[PDB]
Structure formats: C-alpha cells, structure tokens
C-alpha cells in the first residue's frame, strides 16, 4: 500500500534531514511531505519570535489543516519532533492514521508534556560545546540553544559521513525546547493524542537518546509496536535510510 | 601548500552546496569558509530586502573586511558567484590570492556589469518551470525568481544524486539576478578586479551553462588559466568532487 508520509524534524533541524530518506520512500510509491517547523531550515522566523512549542508546530497545524476531508497521513517524528507529533494529534487526530517515532521523545497523557524532557536532560545532561541563550516571548524567558559542533559530531551523527555532518554543521540553527513552557501547558489528551497509532522505531547505538532513555520511554507509555534498528547511530535517517524505509512500508501496509 | 578557500554559491542557493567539497578540502590541509550570502541559505533575510547584487554580497564583504592585514584567501565562485567575486576585488584585492571560477559568470572591465548576465539570457533563454515575480527596492523594480523543479532536476543536477537533488528542491530559495541593475552600475575596475589572477573551471557537459556560453566567456576575457573537467554536470563540486579539490589544491600551490 501507499501512503502519504509527513516528516517531522527535531529542533535545531529542519526538513533537508529528511533528503536521503524523502526519495526512497517516494520510490516506493508514497507520497511524503518533509516541513520546516517554525524558525526551523528556511524558514523565515527567528526563533526569538516563537514562544512554546505549540507555537513551533505552526507549520505542521497548518499543512494539517490543509488536507481534504478523508485524507490521512502518517507522522514520522525524529528526536523531539515527538513533541510536535503530540500537538498536532490534538488537533487533527482524525487525519492522522499513525505516528512513528523515530529514536523520538514519546509524550504521554497521564503526566505533564514536559515530563519525558525533564527526564531526557537527566539521563543526558552534558550537552558539551552547545551554547544557550535567553530571550523572553509573551513574558516568559525561553531558553535558547545552539547544538555544539563536537555534540553534532560524536552523539547525533556519530556514524554518519562528513559530507552529512557538513550538512549540520551549515545548516542547524538556534532553537529552544521550550521546556518551561511545556511544563505549563495543558496535558496532551487521551482522546486525541492517547487514540492513535503508536509506532516507536530506535537504535540501541544512539549516543544521546540512550538506551535507558529509551527504553525507560517504552516502559513509560507502551507503544502499540516497537522497532529496533541494528546499528547505525542517532540520525537513523542518515546512516540506515533503507530499514527505515522497510519499516515505513510496513506500517503503511498495517495502518491506515 | 595550504590555503584558506572561500566557497561563494550561486543565486537561490547556499552554502550546503558545498557540503561535499569543503571536508574535502579540509582534507588536504586547507582552511574553508562557505558562507550564506544575503537572502541565501540560512541567512535571515528574504530577497525583497535586498536591492542590489552589491548589497547580496554583503556577508562575503563582512567576511573579507575581518581579515586580518595579511591574511589572504582564495575565492571559488560557482555559476553567478562571479559576479559576487568582482565586487569583491573592487573592495578587497589585496586580500584575494586568486579567484576560481567554478562553471561561473566572468565578468569583465571593458563592458558593463550586466553583460555576460545579458549574454547568458541569450544562450540559455527558456528556464522551463522556473517562476518569476516582482518586489521593489530602493525606486527600482527587480525581478525575482524561483528556480523551477524541472531545470533543477534536468538542467543544474543532471547528473546528481536523488539525495542531492532532494537538497536542492529542500533548500533552494527565492532569489534575483538583479539584471537591471547591474545594467546601471559602475563598471568593475582594473586596478581591482582586473588585476586579480583569475581560473577558469568548466566542463563542456553543463546543461546550463552551455559550451558556448563558457566558450565565449574565456574569449570574451581570457583567464590566467583555464581547467577543462571531462564529465559531471553543472554541479561539479557534487559530480566531480575529487577533480574540483585536486584543481584547487594546485592552484594553492600556484597562487599565493
């Protein structure tokens, strides 16, 4: 079956993490749409302009919105992108036929949206040469951060190529977490986010969501099905682009 | 020998262009810098902003202004990168080693900036999917463009790979040739850019600019050297990676 696949970058990031993985599914057959959430990629905001995280997902709100009644899509979500896949199934949970997390943060309904941050900066604390900043926003101070470039290199694209690296080093930009924020928002809610399709796909080789991290997550909030990845690193999109694309035409052969 | 190269993209592109390139080159020793120019890339500017293809240039002029005294570097142009090297060595020559001109514009001192814009209209008049429009900056109307899909794909990245494709339709902005405007400005100098040493690189197989193009460019203004690379496409430094870092590397060790 084809489906129509939406990916979802983490911060810092933007849509061209997505450009080995977007062609091969599309040589599939799918159709896939790969977003520069807010201040993210090229996208022309700041991010001293968006002020929660809410706010971050405009564009996924937006091409969400868009589609035609009965269209559905299935969400690909890396790294914190799992946050996004949560707001946005709040809105639109009847467009979506399935989320996938992708070694993604995985929101729950039964504690606060910060929740599974607060305990990634736990297990991982020491984010090495990435830089912060503060900026307020709609009178609260956001916390801003840049990936360091030795953090980029040794924990998110571990195994990958220089000339991807390359690509991150150019292209990662300033972004926020919003961790404050969510940590004051709403909870995100059983009938909308806690009704759909849960597919969580990892790597137990990923250097910064490690493996007690994620399995922790597992534990937390039981995923409807679970795929490990052997090998690779992080940036699975990157360094195992085709047994991510076996898994997606799996769920779109499941999931509808 | 070691230099510091400054890889300048072309319009509607940006930096990551160069993401093969530039670890190549860091490879062999070499400093790089591959910078965003203004409205490019990641830069937070958009094009209406802008009104000339001097003020385009304004980060590759920024850059060449915190050069210490002493400091000098290499510039490689790609495509309409030229230009943007002209206007640089009308600043700047004395910090310029040498300008590589990589399947790029040559302008000349004897007729006015415009000109091989004008002839390349000529040559290659039918950009196929590429969209137009107008803003007005500064009492001038300028025309802007979005390179079309199609002429990426057949004319730019003939020979590149889906995933370097997928970049270029990910990142590739709205961008202008400020032909009009060019068309008014001063002349480049000979005291400045016409006494830079100046390298040609080409191959006859880009689909854009033409062998004639090329052709009459190295007549029309003849460069201190020229280098022909068989095969590739437009695109050499993601074709034709290896060939474009051995070319520099001897023109480091030529041009000091």
Same mark, same amino acid.
């Given at each position: 079956?084809?489906?129509?696949?939406?990916?979802?970058?983490?911060?810092?990031?933007?849509?061209?993490?997505?450009?080995?993985?977007?062609?091969?599914?599309?040589?599939?057959?799918?159709?896939?749409?790969?977003?520069?959430?807010?201040?993210? +990629?090229?996208?022309?905001?700041?991010?001293?302009?968006?002020?929660?995280?809410?706010?971050?997902? *405009?564009?996924?709100?937006?091409?969400? *919105?868009?589609?035609?009644?009965?269209?559905?899509?299935?969400?690909?979500?890396?790294?914190?992108?799992?946050?996004? /896949?949560?707001?946005?199934?709040?809105?639109?949970?009847?467009?979506?036929?399935?989320?996938?997390?992708?070694?993604?943060?995985?929101?729950?309904?039964?504690?606060?949206?910060?929740?599974?941050?607060?305990?990634?900066? &736990?297990?991982?604390?020491?984010?090495?040469?990435?830089?912060? !900043?503060?900026?307020?926003?709609? %009178?609260?101070?956001?916390?801003?951060?840049?990936?360091?470039?030795?953090?980029?290199?040794?924990?998110?694209?571990?195994?990958? %190529?220089? &000339?991807?690296?390359?690509?991150?080093?150019?292209?990662?930009?300033? +972004?926020?977490?919003?961790?404050?924020?969510?940590?004051?928002?709403?909870?995100?809610?059983?009938? %909308?986010? +806690?009704? /759909?399709?849960?597919?969580?796909?990892?790597?137990?080789?990923?250097?910064? !969501?490690?493996?007690? !991290?994620?399995?922790?997550? /597992?534990?937390?909030?039981?995923?409807?099905?679970?795929?490990?990845?052997? +090998?690779?690193?992080?940036?699975?999109?990157?360094?195992?682009?085709?047994?991510?694309?076996?898994?997606?035409? *799996?769920?779109?052969?499941?999931?509808?």
């Amino acid at each position: 079956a084809f489906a129509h696949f939406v990916l979802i970058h983490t911060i810092c990031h933007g849509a061209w993490i997505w450009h080995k993985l977007k062609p091969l599914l599309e040589a599939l057959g799918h159709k896939v749409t790969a977003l520069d959430l807010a201040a993210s +990629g090229v996208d022309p905001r700041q991010i001293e302009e968006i002020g929660s995280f809410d706010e971050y997902s *405009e564009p996924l709100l937006t091409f969400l *919105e868009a589609l035609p009644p009965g269209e559905k899509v299935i969400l690909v979500g890396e790294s914190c992108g799992g946050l996004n /896949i949560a707001i946005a199934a709040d809105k639109y949970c009847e467009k979506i036929a399935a989320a996938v997390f992708h070694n993604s943060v995985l929101p729950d309904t039964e504690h606060c949206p910060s929740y599974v941050v607060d305990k990634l900066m &736990e297990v991982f604390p020491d984010w090495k040469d990435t830089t912060y !900043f503060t900026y307020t926003k709609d %009178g609260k101070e956001i916390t801003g951060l840049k990936l360091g470039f030795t953090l980029l290199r040794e924990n998110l694209y571990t195994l990958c %190529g220089p &000339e991807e690296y390359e690509l991150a080093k150019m292209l990662t930009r300033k +972004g926020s977490l919003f961790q404050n924020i969510l940590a004051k928002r709403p909870f995100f809610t059983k009938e %909308g986010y +806690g009704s /759909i399709k849960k597919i969580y796909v990892w790597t137990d080789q990923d250097e910064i !969501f490690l493996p007690e !991290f994620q399995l922790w997550q /597992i534990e937390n909030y039981k995923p409807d099905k679970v795929y490990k990845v052997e +090998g690779g690193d992080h940036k699975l999109q990157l360094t195992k682009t085709k047994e991510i694309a076996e898994i997606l035409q *799996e769920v779109a052969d499941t999931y509808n």
